[PDB]
């Protein structure tokens, strides 16, 4: 029975959102593994199934509600519950397939999707790239609605994918990157919806390589650069962890800590 972090868009503020994400980062990581000031998520191979998941319960003004499940090892949405039905992305390996069986064990209808939660697949299903899908309280309230109505036969696949894209970013990506948390806080604060720019998209795409680059680094210095993009989409490169400290909040486990 996994811990449950609760958030509502109804009355949402920059502070309630922050406390939320903060509590989410705290449940993902014991905090035992910190390298170059950046906490590393628990390792997947050893992890006991009773410590593998975290539940996020979302609400909106409509008073609709879905519960997302996050993987403690990557912080990604792996599935969600709405009513008496639960839905999960196609897991890459077999080990992860097993683990999923321990989530929402009490509703009558379990389903596995015929697609992963990877952006390219989601973007295809939605008929829209991330840079064309607005983020913010508004969008979030709508995702929640659509995730819920999917379990009633109300929302079609395209809108579901879109909604996944919104939740994954405003939650998973924000947990991983403080820079992205900051992007969301700006919206809300000013009551905006806007699509994420290159600076955001490009980070969401390099979290994996970034983690490796830092963990395999030579006291911070990358073996080889990571390609990033500025707000205007101009290409650039990072070679050292010290410049990413304010940017990245969590790392996926790649290597063992260097003694």
């Amino acid at each position, epitope marked *: 029975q996994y811990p449950i972090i609760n958030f509502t868009t109804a009355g949402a503020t920059v502070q309630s959102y922050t406390n939320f994400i903060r509590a989410v980062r705290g449940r993902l990581t014991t905090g035992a593994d910190v390298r170059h000031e950046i906490p590393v998520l628990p390792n997947r191979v050893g992890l006991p199934i009773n410590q593998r998941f975290i539940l996020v319960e979302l609400s909106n003004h409509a008073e609709l509600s879905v519960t997302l499940a996050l993987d403690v090892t990557n912080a990604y949405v792996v599935g969600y519950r709405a009513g008496n039905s639960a839905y999960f992305f196609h897991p890459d390996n077999q080990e992860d397939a097993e683990a999923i069986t321990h989530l929402f064990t009490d509703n009558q209808n379990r389903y596995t999707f015929a697609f992963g939660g*990877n952006y*390219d697949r989601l973007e295809q299903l939605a008929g829209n790239l991330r840079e064309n899908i607005e983020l913010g309280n508004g969008p979030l309230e709508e995702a929640i609605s659509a995730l819920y109505y999917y379990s009633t036969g109300g929302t079609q696949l395209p809108t579901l994918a879109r909604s996944f894209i919104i939740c994954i970013q405003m939650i998973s990506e924000a947990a991983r990157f403080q820079y992205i948390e900051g992007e969301m806080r700006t919206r809300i604060r000013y009551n905006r919806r806007s699509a994420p720019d290159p600076s955001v998209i490009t980070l969401e795409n390099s979290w*994996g390589r970034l983690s490796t680059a830092i963990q395999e680094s030579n006291q911070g210095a990358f073996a080889s650069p990571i390609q990033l993009q500025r707000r205007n989409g101009s290409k650039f490169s990072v070679y050292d962890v010290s410049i990413l400290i304010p940017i990245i909040a969590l790392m996926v486990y790649r290597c063992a800590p260097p003694p």
Partner: nanobody
Amino acid sequence: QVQLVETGLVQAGGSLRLSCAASGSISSLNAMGWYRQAPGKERELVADISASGRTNYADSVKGRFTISRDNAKNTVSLQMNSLKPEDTAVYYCNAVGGTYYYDEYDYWGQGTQVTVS
């Protein structure tokens, strides 16, 4: 279990096409692209493209190289026109994928030499 295969001497200002096919457990395969390295220098992103149609291009090759992707057969193409001696390098195909994050795996090709002038 994911493999990359690279098919494709040219004179200055000529054209050339490079391909990269993917196969095996590529269900959540995301972006695919081409890097290059001139000995002693460094790896440079050249181009990449997401199955969803997002294309990136190094400044150097804008208006010269065109990258195309065929989803049906999980393959990527690189059309290289107006070649310069500066383009001379070992070119590497690259693929990224993952269901739980964009780049859970980061696979590289063995590389194909390209010589100009």
